[PDB]
Amino acid sequence: SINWASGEDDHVVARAEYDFAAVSEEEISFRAGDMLNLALKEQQPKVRGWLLASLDGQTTGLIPANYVKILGKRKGRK
Ligand SMILES: [Zn+2]
């Protein structure tokens, strides 16, 4: 298990431009201003137009790519 969601392993961070309420259990919710952890390219599930992300560092899921701005790669805390 690659622990990008917790930030224990290397991860990408993104800032939410808008609020988002998950309609599917595959999706996760967040608010404008939230920082989200994203899986590295290799662990991205390549669902067209979505990114695998975590807000709370435990629940991972899909978020709409144009609701966030990718800021950069971050070293795991381990
Ligand atoms: Zn981090």
Numbering used by the authors: 264 to 341
Copy text verbatim from the article accompanying this structure deposition.
Import of proteins into peroxisomes depends on PEX5, PEX13 and PEX14. Strikingly, intramolecular interaction of the PEX13 FxxxF motif regulates binding of PEX5 WxxxF/Y motifs to the PEX13 SH3 domain.
Structures of the apo SH3 domain and SH3-(GS)2-FxxxF were solved by X-ray crystallography at 1.8Å and 2.3Å resolution, respectively. Analysis of the structure of the SH3 domain shows a network of polar contacts between the N- and C-terminal regions stabilizing the β1/β5 interaction, consistent with the extended domain boundaries observed by NMR. Interestingly, nine out of the eleven Arg and Lys residues are located at the FxxxF binding surface, forming a positively charged surface area, which is favorable for binding negatively charged peptides such as the C-terminal FxxxF motif. In contrast, the PxxP binding site located at the opposite side of the SH3 domain, is mostly negatively charged.
